[PDB]
């Protein structure tokens, strides 16, 4: 039932959040609120996490393992990194396909909770906005 899902979605979250530097940036009530909303997920190596052109309704914090980003300047994102923010900020479709490189643990943040986070923390909202710009900049360069 729903109770099992709620426990499964949370049971790992606090342990894993220590691996997200972005959230060292948060007041404690804000961090706890966000951690309750996060959902921890493990994705097997090779599996697609988000696909270019599809709608985006969440973003992801990498907490164990790594992902591969298929862009003009391909990159790997490991613990502490994040992806999926661009679609949440622009309302546009996913701009690149991201796949598990090794088996990867992620903390998933749904759009509503991303908006609450950004409305709560100007520092963090700006980090997301600048990260999206950086990534667009990387894409623009051969």
Ligand X SMILES: Nc1nc2c(ncn2[C@@H]2O[C@@H]3COP(=O)(O)O[C@H]3[C@H]2O)c(=O)[nH]1
Binding site partner of 71, from Na ion, ligand X, none, Cβ cut-off 5-8 A by kind: ligand X
**What residues does 70 pair with on adjacent strands?**
97
Provide the sign of the torsion angle of the four alpha carbons 138, 49, 118, 111, taken in this order: positive
Tokens of 54: 């599809």
For Na ion, the binding residues in 70-129 under the rule CB under 5 A are none
Residues 6 or more apart whose Cβ sits within 8 Å of residue 71: 95, 96, 135, 138, 139
DSSP H or E stretch at residue 97:
strand 97-100
Q: Is 64 annotated as a binding residue?
A: no
113 forms part of the interface with ligand X (CB under 6 A): no
Q: Is 95 annotated as a binding residue?
A: yes
**Binder among 20, 98, 100, 101 for ligand X (CB under 6 A):** 98
For ligand X, the binding residues in 37-96 under the rule CB under 6 A are 50, 56, 69, 71, 73, 75, 83-87, 94-96
Annotated binding site for 3',5'-cyclic AMP: 84-85, 94-95, 135
């Amino acid at each position: 039932g729903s109770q099992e899902v709620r426990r499964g979605d949370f049971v790992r979250n606090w342990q894993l959040v220590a691996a997200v530097p972005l959230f060292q940036k948060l007041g404690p009530a804000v961090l706890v609120e966000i951690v309750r909303a996060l959902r921890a997920r493990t994705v097997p190596a090779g599996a697609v996490i988000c696909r270019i052109g599809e709608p985006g309704d969440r973003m992801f914090f990498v907490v164990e393992g790594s992902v591969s980003v298929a862009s003009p300047n391909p990159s790997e994102l490991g613990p502490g990194a994040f992806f999926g923010e661009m679609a949440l900020i622009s309302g546009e479709p996913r701009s690149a396909t991201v796949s598990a490189a090794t088996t990867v643990s992620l903390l998933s943040l749904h759009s509503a909770d991303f908006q609450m986070l950004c409305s709560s923390s100007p520092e963090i909202a700006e980090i997301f906005r600048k990260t999206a710009l950086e990534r667009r900049g990387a894409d623009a360069s051969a």
